[PDB]
Design a protein around this ligand. Sequence first.
Ligand SMILES: [Zn+2]
Ligand SMILES: [Zn+2]
Ligand SMILES: [Zn+2]
Lengths: 380, 154, 604
Amino acid sequence: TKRWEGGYERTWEILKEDESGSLKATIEDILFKAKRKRVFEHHGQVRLGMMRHLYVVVDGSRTMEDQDLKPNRLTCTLKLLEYFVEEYFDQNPISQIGIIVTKSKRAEKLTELSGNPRKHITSLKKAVDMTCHGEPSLYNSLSIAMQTLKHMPGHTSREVLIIFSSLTTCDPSNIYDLIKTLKAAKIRVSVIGLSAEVRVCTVLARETGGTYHVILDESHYKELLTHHVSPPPASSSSECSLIRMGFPQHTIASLSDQDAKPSFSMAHLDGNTEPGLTLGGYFCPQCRAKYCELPVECKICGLTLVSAPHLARSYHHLFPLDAFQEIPLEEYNGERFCYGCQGELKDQHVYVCAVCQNVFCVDCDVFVHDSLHCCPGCIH
Amino acid sequence: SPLDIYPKILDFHPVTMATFTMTLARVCLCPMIIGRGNDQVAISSKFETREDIAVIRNYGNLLLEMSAVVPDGIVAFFTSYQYMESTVASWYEQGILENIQRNKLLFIETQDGAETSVALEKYQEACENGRGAILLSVARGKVSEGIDFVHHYG
Amino acid sequence: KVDEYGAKDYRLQMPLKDDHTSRPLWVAPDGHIFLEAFSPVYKYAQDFLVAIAEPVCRPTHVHEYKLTAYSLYAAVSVGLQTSDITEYLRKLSKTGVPDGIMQFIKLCTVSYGKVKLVLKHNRYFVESCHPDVIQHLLQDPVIRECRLRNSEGEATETVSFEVKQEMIEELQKRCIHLEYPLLAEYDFRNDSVNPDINIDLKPTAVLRPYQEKSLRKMFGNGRARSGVIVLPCGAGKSLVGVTAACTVRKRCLVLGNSAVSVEQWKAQFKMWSTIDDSQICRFTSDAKDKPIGCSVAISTYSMLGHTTKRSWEAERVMEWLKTQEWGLMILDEVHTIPAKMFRRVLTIVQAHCKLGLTATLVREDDKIVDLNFLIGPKLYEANWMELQNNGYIAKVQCAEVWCPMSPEFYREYVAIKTKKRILLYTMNPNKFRACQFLIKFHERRNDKIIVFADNVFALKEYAIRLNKPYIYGPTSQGERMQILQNFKHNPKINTIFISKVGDTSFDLPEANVLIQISSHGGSRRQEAQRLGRVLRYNAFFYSLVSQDTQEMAYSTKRQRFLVDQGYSFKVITKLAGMEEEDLAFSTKEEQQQLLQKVLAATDL
Ligand SMILES: [Zn+2]
Ligand SMILES: [Zn+2]
Ligand SMILES: [Zn+2]
């Protein structure tokens, strides 16, 4: 049989009248039910993460000159890569990104593996005017990625992302041995092709544990990149994994005090133009090196400089707020004012925290569970 | 396909005349017939036009720009060994076969059984990785029915 | 009733406004329903009103529905009874039901199941539960010719008699005039006379909830009745027909309008029904895939109603086809059913259920009312606004941008009146510049463009000027097919011109920009169909008209259907960057040269 071949649904039977005007109670109930449409979780997915050293491999062959994506594959790929880098650094505080470009059967490490977002974006913008020639070489790119990631600590999740536009790759040696070596190195490899499915890419993704996808259009490309943004799940406890990192306070300098000390920035010193000799900035807690951007690993002492709010923004996942107990207004024998907004309690249901036993209205409960992530009563 | 010619080619009395077409969640095959080329000239393998330069150039261009869209192996069939060798010689004479070579590897099937076997083996091993390859053969050859081009092959 | 301000005022008629505003509904004495969309009970009220009345306008805030006899017949066809509908209408009134609506509803709903029309052994019979109505309609002179030979009393069991097969339309037309409407209910669950086929749709063709409502309303109590389902072309229309055919599980007949729509229906069946090619046959004198002995047969109009000598193979196929019953005869593009030759196609074949599907039910010559008894009542009418709000239909930003008439053309426009002015405002240089600017702007952003244009004579110089592909319309079959095939998967070419050919249900690929110039006179159906070719602000379509010409009135009068559907036409008077780049007809020399070639027609 079929679900639609039975009886016609009569949804209007829900409403009923008993006092010639009780429809107001029904519409009030409908309005109350309309709220609380969320699961009280902004993400609802992975509640933790792990440090990722992600390498992005970009094809630079003649196939990038194709105009499947306006204006050409290279420009759209670089723009979406800039967006991906921005989002990935936004959602990963202590992750690192390296960029490799394959061209003319060779691989060039365009950018070093680091956590600076501006440097990667600058390199990508510079690479827009490159020359597309030759054929890609997956073997060389994977060899470079493995050599760079061979010495990385085990607790970090080593991931390699390949954007393969051309359907042909030139390998100076056997590639399956390299795939076995990568599998022994526990390196995750994911490939996002553009033209069609390639057997070698699928085999590599399956053996290394990654995912292989093929782009349908620019929207699908962006969706795949956004899916790759999310960090992989992490084990409960792996090893003694830690890292010595500093928290440089943003100490500016004012000429009113006698300690107005100008200093050239370490990052700006390598530029062709005159480095910005600003009044102040971020001073390294270890060697007093001055930096303008964060998070940037210190050039002098090798210390990692991170911003504390960025790390703290994900702390609510570690200690999620328990759902409040829903109690009807009639059954609660106490104050009729919300503890959070001081508003009068007129809703049919009142929510009470299990810890401090305070009273919160529907709006305040939703605000606490969605944005505040902390019970105001428990703070006191 | 013709169920009316087999009963009369050999003395036969069929009572079935039954055909079946496979169906899947998606169309697994995309047959298409290519007529005139980019020059609006027919690419028919006519006997009077076997030595024609235009048709050979169109065939080479089709095999070139086709080799860059379908990866990991393309199986091409020609009318005869003589026509196949005359076509590949003309392609080698022009600066066109190198463009196909730099995309996919070219393997030619010959009458030698051992040579054909080793050519098939190297074609398979080249299609295993991302190099890709082209297998040129003849319709009326022992390699046409001796092997099956399973998925990811051809 | 009073005309103090020229408005029909019924303040005194319905004062029942007890408490206070919770019912989002208003009734009218003669008949009308007003619904407030911004109410918490909006969905339930919509579900109730759709099953009982058809809409007349669906803007963003206040919907307006109309009560008709056929709407009440459809409502009582479903399990809803008189008491339920009356009590729920009174439940949500906020003003009180006038004592002119209850009587009308009672009269409409009382005489619903009294008379039925049934088909058995290739014989049409009329069966009545109450024997008195047989004598009541016996005195009607027109009914007496249906019986042959005079059908004494057909004493069975319940009084019935046979009727003439070729004159079934006349008795159907007379019965509603006699306030005894006929119903076409086919209880396919228990037939045991029909060789039910093994059709079964694959369990992977999921359907949206809006199609679920229409399908459920079609099968209310285990039986299928004839009706009309209106869904947009971009939405899923053929899927509903395929699902209905699978559920009926009987021999299906599909009728299309064009010789290419039969291929579309065959593809839909091959995609969402899991039926072997042996059973599926197309009868259009093109391949002749042995239509004799088939489960589902797909053909087109203008061939089942031939008034001339028919082909020998076609004659034999028609003779075979007119000798057996059909289950769920499916009609496509039902809006153009009430024609001189298309109506008799219904009477030339015998079928139990007649299911008609269309996207643009609007038609001139007020022949849609005839379709109420030709096939059945208006079953489902999709709400396009909420359909596009779900994101499954492209939110097309409708535009109505006009261009001033150039002086070199307006003198000739006002000088001539003998129908020669059609080309004049069609070939307006300003409209040409606006169209070229829109084409270039949308090509610079890589958007697919379809340009509709009637008056193919103008379209010739309109398309050859820009050196762009165009479909004259009688070009060929292959050329149009290859042009449309390479139109979608080619970045080099993304704009085509169509001359009234795209005014039906074709396989045109997805497009985002539509620019129509010099369309038909007042065909709301044509504009609705053209708008349907874009949806599938994801997209937007423009209409170009010439000011101070009949095109202004035509565009105003042909958009009243879409505004009832909820679309709003923003007026654009200035185009940004008109002089930024170079366009055709920049100087007056070529503009005045155009006058000689546009007056060179002289078709006398
Ligand atoms: Zn330092
Ligand atoms: Zn509160
Ligand atoms: Zn608390």
